[PDB]
């Protein structure tokens, strides 16, 4: 089997991407944020505290003839920005782009933090990291990909995120028309439960490539590219007037600037992020200070190849017995 679904930016900055997901019988379609940096499929629901729902579409398990309470199971998750959600668990039929999993754990939110409530475009998350990170207790549950894997034509999914435009998540096949050149594959560490890999270096604009190992994760749920402070300083030094602002929370730059590209290495291959992908617009409405799309990871504890990086590539998440990642230009 295979599946193929379009993923759409939630706003004009590509803050995040939503993909329609069919849950239950008859189908209830929710727009979920496919997250390769987490392993829970959770949704706004008829159980979510009413004051914490503001425009999201909800899953109502009582209206699904295939929903079953997973007795005794609860979940609770906290993310990198400090947001969080928690609740109980149903199993139900879940389909993405024509690919159907029966008995998928659908984690129903009883509580969500304010950043979730305040975003009306995200109806929940669909985790695509390794199932070892799933938070369901006392019986950990498998991700949608883990459940689908054995049925797929090939045990892979691909992320093809658009710049200010829709893109595609495919399951079970590699669309050879969706990229240019060849796909370069690179080793993955599954020890921490993420798609963790090592970039071979970087370049700023037309500058020389610096060969240096940068360990990080391929995170479709993260908006920005978070890299070591040395790398980030080298990038922003090429933008006149750019500076790190403690009050704003990162590097800002004059909105009048033209940004240089940023290249990252994948083995001997190179992925080029155009400068425009690094512009996240005014820090507040009407400001002439703009927020940068490359930021320091120093306060995180790991480097994160988020959407800024991934949208410059066609990315293969190869879930074979020994997982690997593939990157191609496009
Ligand atoms: C960090 O929160 C999220 O990822 C979601 N609320 C999506 C989102 C990300 C950034 C932003 F400026 C607006 C929305
Ligand atoms: C740092 O982790 C992240 O931000 C994503 N991997 C998870 C995440 C996705 C959407 C959202 F609204 C909040 C958090």
Curated annotation (Swiss-Prot):
GO terms for molecular function: aspartic-type endopeptidase activity. Disulfide bonds join 255-290. It catalyses: Hydrolysis of proteins with specificity similar to that of pepsin A, prefers hydrophobic residues at P1 and P1', but does not cleave 14-Ala-|-Leu-15 in the B chain of insulin or Z-Glu-Tyr. Clots milk. One of its GO terms (biological process) is proteolysis. Its EC number is 3.4.23.22. Keywords: Aspartyl protease, Disulfide bond, Hydrolase, Protease, Signal, Zymogen. Residues 17-328 form the Peptidase A1 domain. The keyword Signal applies. The keyword Protease applies. The active site is at 35, 199. Transmembrane segments: none annotated. Belongs to the peptidase A1 family. This is Endothiapepsin. The gene is EAPA.
